[PDB]
Amino acid sequence: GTSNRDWWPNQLDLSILHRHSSLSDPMGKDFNYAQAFEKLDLAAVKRDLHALMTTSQDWWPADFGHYGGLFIRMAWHSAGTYRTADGRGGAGEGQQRFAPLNSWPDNDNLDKARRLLWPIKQKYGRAISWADLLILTGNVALESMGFKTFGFAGGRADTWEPEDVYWGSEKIWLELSGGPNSRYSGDRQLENPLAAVQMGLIYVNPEGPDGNPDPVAAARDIRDTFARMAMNDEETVALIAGGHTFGKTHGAGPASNVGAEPEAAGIEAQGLGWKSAYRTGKGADAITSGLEVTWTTTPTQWSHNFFENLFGYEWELTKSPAGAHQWVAKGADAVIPDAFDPSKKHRPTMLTTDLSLRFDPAYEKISRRFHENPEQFADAFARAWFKLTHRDMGPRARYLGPEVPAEVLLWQDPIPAVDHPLIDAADAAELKAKVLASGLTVSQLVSTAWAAASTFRGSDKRGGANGARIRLAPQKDWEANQPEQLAAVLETLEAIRTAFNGAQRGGKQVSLADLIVLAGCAGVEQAAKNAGHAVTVPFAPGRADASQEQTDVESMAVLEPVADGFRNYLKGKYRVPAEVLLVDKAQLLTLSAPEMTVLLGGLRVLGANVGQSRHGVFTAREQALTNDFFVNLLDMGTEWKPTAADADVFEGRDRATGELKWTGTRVDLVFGSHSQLRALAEVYGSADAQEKFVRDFVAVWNKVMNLDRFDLA
Amino acid sequence: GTSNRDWWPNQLDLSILHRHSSLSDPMGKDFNYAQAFEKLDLAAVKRDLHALMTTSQDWWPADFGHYGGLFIRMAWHSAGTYRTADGRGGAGEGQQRFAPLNSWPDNDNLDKARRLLWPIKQKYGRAISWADLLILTGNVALESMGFKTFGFAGGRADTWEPEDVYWGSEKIWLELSGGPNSRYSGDRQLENPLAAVQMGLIYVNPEGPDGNPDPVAAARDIRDTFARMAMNDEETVALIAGGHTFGKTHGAGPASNVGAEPEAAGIEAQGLGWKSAYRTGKGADAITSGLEVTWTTTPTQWSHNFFENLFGYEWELTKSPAGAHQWVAKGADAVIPDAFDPSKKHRPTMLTTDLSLRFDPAYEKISRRFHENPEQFADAFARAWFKLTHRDMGPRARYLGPEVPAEVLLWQDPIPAVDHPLIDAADAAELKAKVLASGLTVSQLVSTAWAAASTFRGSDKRGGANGARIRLAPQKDWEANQPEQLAAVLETLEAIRTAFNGAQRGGKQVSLADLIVLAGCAGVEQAAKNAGHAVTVPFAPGRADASQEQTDVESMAVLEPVADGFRNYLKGKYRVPAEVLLVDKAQLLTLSAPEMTVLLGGLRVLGANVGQSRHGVFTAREQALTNDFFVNLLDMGTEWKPTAADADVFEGRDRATGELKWTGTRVDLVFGSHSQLRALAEVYGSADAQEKFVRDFVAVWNKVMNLDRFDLA
Ligand code: HEM
Ligand code: HEM
Ligand code: NA
Ligand code: NA
């Protein structure tokens, strides 16, 4: 069946905004996972998980009689898809059970791991999501094997179809760099937003960069990809060495024995894949990565043996039985146990990427510190395992259950507790009137509140107006935020705040985070009033102000909007057309197409554009909340052409006289071009739609203001 | 961006069940189009449309100063995509404004037509849908030019994204037959469900079959495609000659002048396409099809001059200025007016397909009758135009407005009026108890009610339980319906009905259509009872019984289920895997993936399979409504393998002992294979799911029972 994608492969794809509908979700529209989880007997689940560890099934026998290593790898891959660039991937939606990740090469045989967990999933049902279960099982594996974890939070709700993620452009699994769709250019620069070296890998190639077994050059890829997963050098060394304290790799024979990945397998395989024709196909004969390495003398118990081995031998390059590059300890005795045969032992072995930890000079210093101080190693790994597995969960308000660590961590972008009474309706009316009396304009108030709130992304639930981090480094300096205008708005708001707070009795006070949002609401009200409409914009207080010391400036950089079609802003020239970037931003904001349409049309006439650009400002009454953008956009009296100077700017001229009426960008005109967007614009550009437009705009505005409000919702 | 479709291009696609979500719809959840339409001033809309016919815009000047012919074509293409095989296509969802239809080659310059209607669409807003407007404008065009129409119904709600339709497998627009993706095989057999001869055409090639200008062979393609659009010989001749009473074709110069279709055009084109570099690019210079034919001496007025010309001259094969084949009247005077230059006249011209109406001997008889009796011709055409533009609207209860024709037409599958009091809740309880006391089993009651209700298809809104047409030819004899078992059930239910109706006072009575549905409800209640669960299944009376004389048997044939995965039924061997056909049936029933999953699992254990096949009957308590299908399917203790005899049947054996536990088809096992369906099955197979399963099954059962109940809309 030929589809629209086949005929017009570069048209914009709006279906990413309408994923995750009530249609595809088997749970009722009222189902609340948090509530179901809070009633789970978590201790019972963990008892069943402990039992499972050593209950070997014949269809995938447990190495060393213990599945712990398999399950640690499973949890680590669940978490490992995360990219800091967009917040996409990670463990938080349980996506490992869906395409493509269920069938990525690096997820080979983790289908077996997941199937071993079905009986537990079945027994506890909706009260523990797969997403939570994959992480908790990893925790229990570590505990079962003697490692004390730093804690665990539940609350990852399951999802029901695959997430739309750009994982790269290659059309071949595992394609090496420099192909026609290379993710690399120049001096090994990985394209944003990617965070892995080859299509279908989690981070790096375990043989070395594009297969070349150089531990020093492998280290470079490790550092880069782990940084792109929000992990620094100490955390990276702790995780790799921590992980590889356990279990083993699987490469007992050639890879040509292994058949189709799960999404390609026959219907009879019942959701499993990588069926192997080598000997028994499993256990002692297992083939997963192709490498055959077992790191420690006690693969089912926490130990300090990884760094003893790493530093205590010299390493020789060799090949696994499948032909992969790996390393064996020069002159060592056979001290490593076999996974199935008590009469066999093996010499110590390492991956290229393990040797990175010794041969990269910066890693070597950390690795030695961990070798010499194993308690520091254990604490770093526990903290890093928690960060790994929680980094995409968002504010601590979302963390459920009785094992949540009390310690607040910088990477959680923490927001202080509110400890005082909040403002009430009367106070909010007072503050709005003071904001409007100050002289701040509709444009300034709307722009500032937009800038504060629209950093939120639903991918990892970072960002938003809570915290008032717009006043801090680095947000206060972002170009999209118009630093000098921003500074003037914040100054006036801060004086309003000070005065209001100084007049109160009791502990009552308003946060700047709340006042930024409320001032934006007053701007929207005033805009509606300018259009001759009475409107009330909802507002929920309770935001708090974070400090600069609670705001990691390097981690904040990934939230900078380099493209924001809602403010007609593009920081540079990008490979992707601007309308694609708009739909991407709408997705991170959790907006549907109709919400994206309404919001952008409104923002245009309110004066939210960066730099007060006239592009898309299709009204003669700026700062009035009207549907003018749609009515003027859709007017067939006007003809549009790209300009001389710039193909991405368009001039709209009267079709009869030739006179210039407007100018717009691609983000503006896509609403007049794309056949689904134009159908939306038509509704809001119709003669009966002014009230609809206002009321839809206010709703989506309030939606955006509340995106990070996990303390309420 | 590599997608799951790219990696696994043959995996089943569930996203067709989740279109049309509340997310993509700009109207509120409570918007009711019929309520908006009933307050439209339809007379005022028609006055605007009438004025528009002769108000020429310079960006697309009106031929002869009158847009009528353009709008008639626009409405005929809106309607002309309809296929009787699946009910997909037609005018009823306004799909011409979306991809792909908006950019089909046969819809060339209809973008102009639709744009001319924006100012009226804008004026009346949500009270008239684009879908309705397209058709109304065609009617008003005919009226304006002196043709009396048969009527008009409103009620086609707008849609907001493209419909998923199989339009063929060709990868090149207009590809001639016999390519690698040929829609033809054998002796010019067009593949079901297609209804056109080439990709991107409405019906046939106006030059002749694959461009060969032979009228006799063209007639064969006309007859075949029109039949596949539910039009017979009389209706086809009336429509083609009726249409071609008006307007003209456009081929003033070569087609290489014409640019990209709308979905490929630049953003500045603002949703228009086929921009032409030939001279002015429009009006007198217009290029649309490439043909340059004007059929009558008064292209803007109804006449009987198409047949006067057709029979009054001999025709010579010629070429248009673009090079297309077309026909000119041998030795005729220049009597046909020019579209822009009052001092020029042209000889009569015809398409190959026009001459079909004279040179195919069956067509010729009808055409002569219409020539000699033009009042017969006007009546046939009015009736056929109404059928053409309404054939996918569904039951007459959906028809809105003051111009709906009072005559009931056989092609409507008419349902008699109900003229007596309906049964009440106490009566329904009494009849359920009588049904259960008769000895009819859960399996019989469920099977029969399923058979009657599951003929519905949301594509053209035909079928469903209303009418009790399951008791009539041809439904009573369809294999899927198990004719001998059916007849026994219907006999017993008819005795129950007779006894209940005979005992009443006061005119109250129950129809057989209602009793068949109610009995099915009693079966599902009894199944729930057998499982230890008291539930009440909703039931809405008001169905009526249609007669054999009100049932067109030949038109009913397309509703026969030759594949019904809900009854594990496949009438023959198909190129398409059975799972794909299941998802296709789910789409026609308007089911989401969770609804399809719950319903199939339930039906299995209720005994709804055709022929009492054991395939998928994964329970040891058949006729009890339990989640056993999912629990047993998902049990890893069972291993599945295709059978020797049949690759499409699978044996489930105990993994340890080898003992045979079950058998199933592809339709069964897909729920344990496909990654998204298995996630659904897991919900209903969990230990906490019995109440959910029951409730969701009752909901979807009731939904299916009510699919055609537009009288309660
Ligand atoms: C540079 C980063 C890493 C590389 C290249 C990498 C590579 C691999 C490979 C190839 C395997 C063998 C798969 C098989 O054949 O069965 C594996 C196993 C595993 N890795 Fe990693 N790894 C990395 C980091 C991690 C991290 C961060 C963790 C956890 C904190 C982790 C924990 C595991 C464990 C427990 C296993 C053993 C699986 C079993 O016993 O079945 N590794 N690693
Ligand atoms: C065998 C069936 C049919 C064929 C092959 C056919 C073919 C065509 C073609 C090739 C054009 C010229 C497009 C252009 O160059 O502008 C056209 C025009 C037209 N057709 Fe048909 N047609 C068929 C049936 C119908 C029917 C069923 C109707 C309506 C009842 C219809 C109404 C018209 C009208 C009104 C125009 C004139 C458009 C104008 O004035 O701009 N045709 N036809
Ligand atoms: Na994420
Ligand atoms: Na249809």
Side-chain angles (χ1 to χ4, degrees):
Chain A
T2 310
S3 74
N4 293 343
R5 234 88 221 62
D6 299 328
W7 295 125
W8 306 289
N10 301 313
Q11 255 313 326
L12 186 51
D13 173 33
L14 290 192
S15 64
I16 73 174
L17 307 182
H18 305 131
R19 236 48 109 179
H20 319 305
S21 80
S22 69
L23 294 181
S24 64
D25 180 356
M27 309 309 296
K29 100 232 274 282
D30 284 347
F31 172 63
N32 183 285
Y33 176 58
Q35 286 176 345
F37 182 86
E38 270 146 49
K39 285 144 68 200
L40 179 75
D41 185 353
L42 184 69
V45 184
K46 292 184 83 191
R47 287 191 290 271
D48 287 339
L49 292 167
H50 276 276
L52 175 66
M53 294 297 150
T54 69
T55 309
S56 184
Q57 297 294 325
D58 293 344
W59 57 258
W60 198 254
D63 300 330
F64 321 96
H66 199 304
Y67 286 122
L70 178 67
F71 288 139
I72 294 175
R73 172 179 163 237
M74 172 197 77
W76 146 239
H77 279 209
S78 185
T81 56
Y82 178 74
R83 311 98 74 94
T84 203
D86 61 1
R88 297 183 176 103
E93 303 183 2
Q95 289 279 306
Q96 189 184 99
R97 70 214 186 98
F98 298 119
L101 297 180
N102 67 12
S103 298
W104 270 8
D106 235 2
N107 286 343
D108 188 327
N109 284 323
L110 293 184
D111 64 313
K112 313 306 184 295
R114 295 190 308 277
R115 178 68 44 90
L116 287 167
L117 285 167
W118 168 235
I120 283 162
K121 184 78 186 82
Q122 178 178 55
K123 173 168 170 183
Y124 293 97
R126 69 204 63 191
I128 191 168
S129 60
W130 274 106
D132 281 347
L133 185 58
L134 301 186
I135 303 303
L136 181 62
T137 301
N139 280 32
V140 167
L142 284 166
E143 287 165 14
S144 175
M145 297 189 295
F147 187 78
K148 181 227 213 330
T149 58
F150 193 79
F152 170 83
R156 300 160 194 83
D158 273 334
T159 46
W160 305 100
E161 60 189 299
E163 186 195 356
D164 302 290
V165 182
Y166 173 71
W167 297 114
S169 296
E170 302 91 335
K171 303 303 187 290
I172 296 158
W173 291 110
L174 304 177
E175 195 181 359
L176 316 184
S177 65
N181 297 297
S182 192
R183 64 179 61 206
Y184 280 97
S185 58
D187 178 22
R188 212 155 165 83
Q189 292 313 288
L190 180 57
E191 63 171 285
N192 294 120
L194 306 182
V197 304
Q198 284 166 242
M199 177 65 86
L201 294 181
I202 298 301
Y203 308 115
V204 308
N205 183 322
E207 289 180 278
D210 294 316
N212 300 309
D214 171 358
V216 178
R220 188 218 195 153
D221 280 12
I222 295 171
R223 178 168 290 107
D224 177 25
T225 56
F226 277 62
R228 285 170 190 245
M229 309 207 165
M231 296 295 184
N232 67 23
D233 277 18
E234 190 175 272
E235 290 167 325
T236 298
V237 173
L239 285 172
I240 292 166
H244 293 171
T245 297
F246 309 95
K248 71 185 294 280
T249 82
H250 308 76
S256 53
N257 287 282
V258 177
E261 71 289 358
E263 290 292 310
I267 207 184
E268 73 282 355
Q270 294 290 283
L272 302 187
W274 298 288
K275 170 87 73 76
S276 171
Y278 184 71
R279 300 170 51 88
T280 69
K282 71 203 183 182
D285 302 321
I287 303 162
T288 302
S289 63
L291 293 147
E292 189 73 27
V293 167
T294 306
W295 302 273
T296 78
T297 57
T298 53
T300 67
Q301 300 173 80
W302 175 244
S303 77
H304 303 149
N305 191 225
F306 175 90
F307 287 123
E308 292 170 344
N309 295 335
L310 180 62
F311 285 112
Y313 299 103
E314 302 303 305
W315 294 97
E316 163 176 308
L317 180 69
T318 185
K319 280 177 157 44
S320 79
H325 302 294
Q326 62 177 58
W327 304 76
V328 67
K330 282 204 267 207
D333 301 327
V335 301
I336 303 296
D338 188 88
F340 293 89
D341 179 348
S343 85
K344 293 205 186 52
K345 288 217 171 349
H346 299 284
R347 287 168 287 163
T349 50
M350 287 284 170
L351 309 168
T352 298
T353 51
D354 295 325
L355 304 191
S356 299
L357 303 188
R358 173 165 171 201
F359 295 105
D360 169 273
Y363 288 152
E364 191 268 359
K365 295 172 182 64
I366 302 165
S367 300
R368 280 216 172 257
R369 187 170 45 90
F370 289 166
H371 186 209
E372 297 173 359
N373 304 278
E375 74 290 353
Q376 289 183 28
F377 173 39
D379 181 60
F381 178 42
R383 288 176 174 268
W385 176 265
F386 182 68
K387 174 180 183 182
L388 169 69
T389 55
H390 298 72
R391 52 201 180 188
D392 61 335
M393 260 188 91
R396 303 180 64 275
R398 301 191 68 237
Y399 291 13
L400 312 176
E403 296 203 22
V404 173
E407 186 178 342
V408 171
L409 307 156
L410 188 59
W411 55 261
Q412 301 168 318
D413 292 355
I415 307 289
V418 182
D419 51 351
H420 57 73
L422 299 177
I423 53 163
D424 54 29
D427 297 327
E430 178 187 351
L431 286 165
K432 284 185 303 191
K434 296 263 176 47
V435 164
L436 296 172
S438 69
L440 286 168
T441 66
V442 165
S443 159
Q444 289 172 308
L445 293 175
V446 170
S447 302
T448 302
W450 176 262
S454 71
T455 58
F456 184 86
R457 67 190 188 184
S459 61
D460 63 358
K461 295 143 194 5
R462 295 184 68 214
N466 206 357
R469 291 179 160 102
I470 196 164
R471 84 198 197 285
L472 304 180
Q475 297 187 21
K476 70 178 192 47
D477 321 289
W478 290 340
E479 182 180 63
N481 289 348
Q482 310 178 108
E484 301 283 5
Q485 185 206 114
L486 176 65
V489 177
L490 294 186
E491 181 176 353
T492 297
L493 299 181
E494 188 54 45
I496 290 169
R497 188 161 95 86
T498 299
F500 177 91
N501 284 350
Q504 309 299 303
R505 302 344 318 175
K508 182 178 283 176
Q509 67 137 75
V510 72
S511 66
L512 190 72
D514 275 347
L515 182 55
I516 287 162
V517 177
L518 177 66
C521 298
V524 170
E525 291 184 345
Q526 179 70 47
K529 187 179 177 192
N530 292 343
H533 294 240
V535 172
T536 34
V537 171
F539 172 76
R543 302 166 186 85
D545 297 338
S547 72
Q548 187 65 71
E549 296 79 6
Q550 301 164 325
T551 304
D552 178 330
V553 162
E554 305 302 316
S555 179
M556 261 310 139
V558 296
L559 297 184
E560 178 179 2
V562 301
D564 186 2
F566 298 103
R567 288 178 273 197
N568 230 341
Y569 177 71
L570 273 179
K571 184 168 178 192
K573 226 103 311 92
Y574 299 109
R575 280 195 205 122
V576 173
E579 69 276 16
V580 177
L581 297 179
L582 167 73
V583 171
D584 168 74
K585 184 53 166 188
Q587 200 275 338
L588 290 176
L589 295 166
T590 74
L591 303 183
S592 66
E595 286 172 341
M596 172 184 72
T597 301
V598 166
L599 176 68
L600 182 143
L603 292 174
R604 286 299 186 273
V605 308
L606 297 169
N609 281 348
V610 172
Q612 297 294 269
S613 174
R614 320 295 314 116
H615 293 336
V617 185
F618 305 153
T619 181
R621 43 189 178 169
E622 188 164 3
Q623 303 188 112
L625 184 64
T626 76
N627 65 342
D628 284 352
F629 172 86
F630 302 103
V631 173
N632 286 313
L633 168 70
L634 293 171
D635 183 357
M636 194 54 180
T638 301
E639 164 174 44
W640 300 87
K641 278 164 171 193
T643 62
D646 194 343
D648 297 324
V649 179
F650 305 82
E651 292 187 336
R653 294 179 178 279
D654 193 288
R655 207 176 276 283
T657 72
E659 180 182 9
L660 199 57
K661 278 149 65 60
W662 314 119
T663 55
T665 64
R666 295 187 71 75
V667 169
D668 305 317
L669 300 201
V670 71
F671 292 95
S673 164
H674 188 279
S675 44
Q676 288 168 260
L677 294 187
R678 183 172 176 108
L680 303 179
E682 286 169 340
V683 169
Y684 294 110
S686 301
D688 66 350
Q690 168 78 2
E691 308 66 24
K692 176 161 168 67
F693 164 76
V694 169
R695 302 286 172 182
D696 292 352
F697 181 86
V698 162
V700 70
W701 175 263
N702 180 63
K703 177 184 174 160
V704 174
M705 297 303 112
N706 283 343
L707 288 165
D708 66 359
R709 303 295 311 272
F710 294 104
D711 63 310
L712 305 171
Chain B
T2 309
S3 73
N4 297 333
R5 225 92 223 61
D6 301 331
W7 295 126
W8 301 294
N10 303 310
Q11 256 317 313
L12 185 53
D13 172 30
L14 296 180
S15 62
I16 72 178
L17 307 183
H18 306 133
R19 300 301 184 221
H20 313 303
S21 86
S22 75
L23 295 177
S24 66
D25 188 350
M27 310 309 296
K29 287 165 77 64
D30 291 342
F31 179 60
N32 182 284
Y33 178 59
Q35 154 193 60
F37 180 86
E38 260 149 333
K39 287 282 186 298
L40 183 73
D41 186 346
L42 180 72
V45 183
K46 297 184 75 193
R47 291 191 302 279
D48 290 341
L49 288 168
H50 179 89
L52 170 66
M53 299 293 151
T54 58
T55 314
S56 185
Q57 298 292 327
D58 293 347
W59 52 261
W60 196 259
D63 305 327
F64 318 94
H66 200 301
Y67 288 125
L70 181 64
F71 289 138
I72 295 174
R73 170 174 167 249
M74 178 194 73
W76 146 239
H77 282 212
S78 182
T81 60
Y82 176 74
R83 310 99 73 93
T84 200
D86 67 358
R88 296 184 175 102
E93 309 176 6
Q95 291 278 313
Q96 188 185 102
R97 67 215 191 96
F98 296 124
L101 297 181
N102 69 9
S103 298
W104 274 5
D106 235 5
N107 291 337
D108 191 326
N109 286 324
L110 296 186
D111 61 315
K112 310 308 184 291
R114 296 192 297 285
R115 180 65 48 93
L116 284 166
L117 288 165
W118 168 234
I120 282 157
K121 183 79 182 83
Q122 177 178 52
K123 173 168 172 187
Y124 292 99
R126 71 185 101 102
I128 190 164
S129 63
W130 275 109
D132 276 349
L133 180 62
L134 303 185
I135 299 310
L136 182 64
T137 300
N139 284 29
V140 168
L142 285 163
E143 297 171 9
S144 76
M145 296 187 291
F147 186 78
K148 174 134 133 304
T149 66
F150 196 71
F152 170 81
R156 298 162 194 85
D158 270 335
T159 52
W160 304 101
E161 60 187 299
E163 192 197 345
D164 302 288
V165 181
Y166 176 71
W167 300 117
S169 297
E170 305 91 331
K171 303 300 193 261
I172 304 170
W173 286 114
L174 306 184
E175 181 171 13
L176 310 180
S177 61
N181 293 297
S182 191
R183 64 179 58 207
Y184 283 96
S185 73
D187 178 13
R188 213 161 165 76
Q189 293 312 288
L190 178 58
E191 62 176 280
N192 288 301
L194 307 176
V197 303
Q198 284 164 247
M199 178 66 85
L201 293 182
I202 300 301
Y203 303 122
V204 301
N205 182 322
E207 291 177 282
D210 292 312
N212 172 219
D214 175 355
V216 173
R220 275 175 250 125
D221 281 3
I222 295 169
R223 177 166 295 102
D224 182 20
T225 52
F226 275 67
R228 284 171 189 247
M229 308 213 162
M231 296 297 179
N232 70 21
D233 281 0
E234 184 177 286
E235 288 165 328
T236 301
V237 174
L239 285 169
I240 292 168
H244 293 173
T245 299
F246 308 95
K248 72 184 295 277
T249 78
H250 306 77
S256 48
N257 286 284
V258 178
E261 72 285 0
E263 288 298 306
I267 212 171
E268 71 283 352
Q270 293 290 284
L272 305 186
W274 299 288
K275 184 211 267 276
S276 171
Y278 184 72
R279 299 171 54 87
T280 70
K282 68 197 177 172
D285 301 321
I287 299 161
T288 302
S289 59
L291 297 143
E292 188 71 28
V293 166
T294 304
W295 302 273
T296 75
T297 62
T298 53
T300 70
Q301 303 180 73
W302 175 243
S303 74
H304 50 100
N305 189 229
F306 171 93
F307 287 121
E308 309 191 102
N309 299 336
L310 188 60
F311 286 118
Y313 300 103
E314 307 296 302
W315 295 97
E316 177 170 304
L317 181 66
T318 184
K319 279 171 146 52
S320 76
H325 303 294
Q326 62 177 58
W327 301 74
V328 65
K330 282 170 187 297
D333 288 333
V335 298
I336 303 291
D338 189 84
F340 294 88
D341 182 339
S343 81
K344 294 219 195 66
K345 289 207 190 313
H346 302 279
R347 285 170 290 163
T349 51
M350 292 282 174
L351 308 164
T352 300
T353 49
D354 295 327
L355 303 190
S356 300
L357 302 191
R358 171 166 171 198
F359 294 107
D360 163 278
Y363 289 150
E364 191 268 357
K365 290 188 172 66
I366 296 166
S367 299
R368 283 216 172 251
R369 183 171 48 85
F370 289 166
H371 176 53
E372 299 299 12
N373 302 277
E375 75 282 44
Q376 289 183 36
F377 171 41
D379 186 63
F381 178 43
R383 291 174 174 269
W385 178 267
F386 182 69
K387 179 181 184 188
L388 164 71
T389 52
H390 294 76
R391 51 198 180 189
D392 63 332
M393 253 185 101
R396 300 183 65 274
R398 299 191 71 239
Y399 290 13
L400 311 176
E403 300 187 23
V404 172
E407 182 184 339
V408 176
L409 306 150
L410 189 65
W411 65 259
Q412 298 168 319
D413 293 349
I415 301 296
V418 180
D419 48 343
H420 57 73
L422 300 182
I423 55 165
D424 63 21
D427 296 331
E430 177 192 343
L431 285 163
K432 284 186 298 193
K434 292 259 175 49
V435 164
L436 294 169
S438 70
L440 289 168
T441 66
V442 163
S443 158
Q444 288 167 313
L445 293 174
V446 172
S447 305
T448 301
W450 177 262
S454 72
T455 59
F456 183 85
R457 66 190 190 183
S459 57
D460 65 356
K461 295 157 174 45
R462 292 184 73 208
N466 203 356
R469 286 188 169 97
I470 198 166
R471 87 197 195 285
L472 305 182
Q475 294 189 22
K476 69 184 173 61
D477 288 308
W478 291 337
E479 181 180 78
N481 289 349
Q482 303 177 116
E484 298 206 349
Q485 300 176 53
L486 177 63
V489 177
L490 293 185
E491 185 161 73
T492 305
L493 293 184
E494 180 65 27
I496 289 172
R497 192 161 93 86
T498 305
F500 176 89
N501 283 347
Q504 305 303 299
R505 291 323 106 193
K508 181 183 277 180
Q509 68 126 263
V510 70
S511 70
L512 190 71
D514 274 348
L515 185 58
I516 285 157
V517 171
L518 184 60
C521 298
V524 165
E525 295 175 355
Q526 183 66 34
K529 195 173 177 157
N530 295 343
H533 298 108
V535 306
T536 286
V537 169
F539 171 77
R543 298 168 191 79
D545 296 339
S547 74
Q548 191 68 69
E549 298 67 34
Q550 302 164 322
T551 300
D552 184 332
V553 161
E554 297 87 13
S555 177
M556 261 305 139
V558 293
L559 298 188
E560 181 180 1
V562 302
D564 187 0
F566 296 104
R567 289 180 275 193
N568 232 344
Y569 176 76
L570 276 182
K571 183 168 189 209
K573 236 266 347 297
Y574 301 111
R575 95 183 40 121
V576 177
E579 72 276 17
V580 171
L581 297 181
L582 168 73
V583 165
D584 170 75
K585 184 61 159 179
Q587 198 278 333
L588 292 174
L589 291 174
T590 75
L591 303 188
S592 68
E595 287 175 334
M596 169 182 74
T597 298
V598 83
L599 176 65
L600 185 142
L603 286 174
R604 287 298 187 275
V605 305
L606 295 169
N609 284 348
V610 169
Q612 303 61 65
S613 175
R614 308 266 81 218
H615 294 336
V617 180
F618 312 144
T619 182
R621 39 193 181 168
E622 188 171 10
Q623 301 189 108
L625 184 62
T626 79
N627 68 342
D628 281 358
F629 175 84
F630 305 105
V631 179
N632 286 314
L633 172 67
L634 296 172
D635 186 353
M636 187 61 181
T638 296
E639 160 176 47
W640 298 86
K641 292 188 178 189
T643 63
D646 193 343
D648 295 326
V649 176
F650 302 83
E651 293 182 346
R653 288 182 182 272
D654 189 284
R655 204 175 279 282
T657 66
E659 169 197 45
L660 186 61
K661 295 167 64 66
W662 311 124
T663 55
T665 60
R666 296 183 71 77
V667 167
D668 305 316
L669 262 80
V670 72
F671 297 93
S673 170
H674 188 275
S675 47
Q676 289 172 258
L677 292 181
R678 183 167 177 109
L680 303 181
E682 286 172 335
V683 173
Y684 294 111
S686 291
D688 66 345
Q690 169 287 143
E691 296 166 63
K692 184 176 168 56
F693 168 72
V694 172
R695 163 181 77 244
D696 294 353
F697 180 82
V698 166
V700 70
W701 175 261
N702 177 67
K703 171 178 166 160
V704 173
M705 297 303 114
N706 283 339
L707 289 166
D708 67 356
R709 301 296 311 277
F710 291 103
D711 60 312
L712 310 169

